[PDB]
Design an enzyme around this catalytic site. Sequence first.
Site, short mmCIF file in Angstrom:
data_model
loop_
_atom_site.label_atom_id
_atom_site.label_comp_id
_atom_site.label_asym_id
_atom_site.label_seq_id
_atom_site.Cartn_x
_atom_site.Cartn_y
_atom_site.Cartn_z
N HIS A 28 -3.06 88.83 60.14
CA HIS A 28 -4.18 88.58 60.92
C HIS A 28 -5.04 87.87 59.55
O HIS A 28 -5.88 87.06 60.11
CB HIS A 28 -4.71 89.66 61.63
CG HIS A 28 -5.06 90.91 60.73
ND1 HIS A 28 -4.24 91.53 59.74
CD2 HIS A 28 -6.30 91.47 60.51
CE1 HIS A 28 -4.94 92.17 59.20
NE2 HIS A 28 -5.94 92.60 59.63
N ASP A 50 3.00 92.86 61.81
CA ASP A 50 1.74 92.28 61.27
C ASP A 50 2.00 92.25 59.81
O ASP A 50 0.95 92.64 59.09
CB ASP A 50 0.72 93.29 62.02
CG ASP A 50 -0.57 92.61 61.93
OD1 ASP A 50 -0.83 91.46 61.07
OD2 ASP A 50 -1.52 92.64 62.73
N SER A 102 -8.14 95.27 54.37
CA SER A 102 -6.76 94.98 54.81
C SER A 102 -5.69 94.74 53.94
O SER A 102 -6.06 94.25 52.63
CB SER A 102 -6.76 94.11 55.96
OG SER A 102 -7.36 94.56 57.15
#
Lengths: 151, 151, 52, 49
Positions: A28, A50, A102
């Site tokens: 992402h 992910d 992240s």
Amino acid sequence: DKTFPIMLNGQVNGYACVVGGRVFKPLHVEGRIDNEQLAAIKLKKASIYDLEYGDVPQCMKSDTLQYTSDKPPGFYNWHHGAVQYENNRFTVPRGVGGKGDSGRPILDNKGRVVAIVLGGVNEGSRTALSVVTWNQKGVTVKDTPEGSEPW
Amino acid sequence: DKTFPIMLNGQVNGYACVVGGRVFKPLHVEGRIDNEQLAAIKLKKASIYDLEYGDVPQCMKSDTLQYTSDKPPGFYNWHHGAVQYENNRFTVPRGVGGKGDSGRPILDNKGRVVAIVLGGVNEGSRTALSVVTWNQKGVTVKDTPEGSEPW
Amino acid sequence: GLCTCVAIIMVSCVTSVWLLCRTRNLCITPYKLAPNAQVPILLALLCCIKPT
Amino acid sequence: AQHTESFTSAISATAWSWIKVLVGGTSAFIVLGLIATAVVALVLFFHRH
């Protein structure tokens, strides 16, 4: 340093990282890595986790954070402070971490990465992190609390 | 302790305990819980253990008492005093506790909930407690000495 | 009939073989991403890998 | 008529099999429920004791 901020509009979107032989970065997060010697190595994506993985240059090779699937409950470090591992979950004191956090590694006391964060929820006085762990056999698995958000 | 006095007409009838993200309340004790925020969650009942369940709201989920099924015989603290685990029986020295004391957690020395008591029966200089224990395999089970009455 | 037989066989074959490839890389990607998990012999045989 | 009906003379094999499958279906479902109730009681008794 041994983890690199990928950049977008100048403003680091996500720190991606170099674990055990492969640079990893979350799917992402969208950004140029900020290390030319990685900023172009094609990434092999896998959405079930992910993340995106890629081999580091053969010169870069001997800088690469170690890892291990054996993580007994206790204290582990983290850039933004200590994370605690209890009841098969990693938790962080409230309000520290968010958009930008992240993909930073979670290291043990001997310095090896046990987890790479992908998200969070603040839950009362703490925060549960949605993370990618190496399960008791060493297989990677994405562990996520309910409602967790892409950081 | 994070327990709450349930009231009706303004006087306490029992204590309601949060463990592992779940309000636990003895089924028999009746009324209104003393914190509005708990007062809204629909309790889902279970007569087999005389408990009413409810998963605690998101904002406090990390501020919930723990539990364990690992119980060596010995001294375990408890609100009203020290509790003795002997012979797979919970005992309290005589005369302490009664109507209103139902549903207070019983903690071990490390701060973990090992039981939530629902009543008691007199044996000599002590009183054996009717309680909710997580048995040696961790399955929840109501352990109750004979003829114990609902507090 | 023959053009629809060649079409329905090819479409079915290629969709199936793409599913077979997708499951093979979905088997393998965890072990690939964890450099040391002691190699299986029923997973590792069935899906292709150079064992440890 | 040279014969007598008997209130079963018209049922026929198909309708027999249908009413059988119906009655047996209801019986089997109810008995499955009752055996499930017994199994839960027994597993709980083994849970404590």
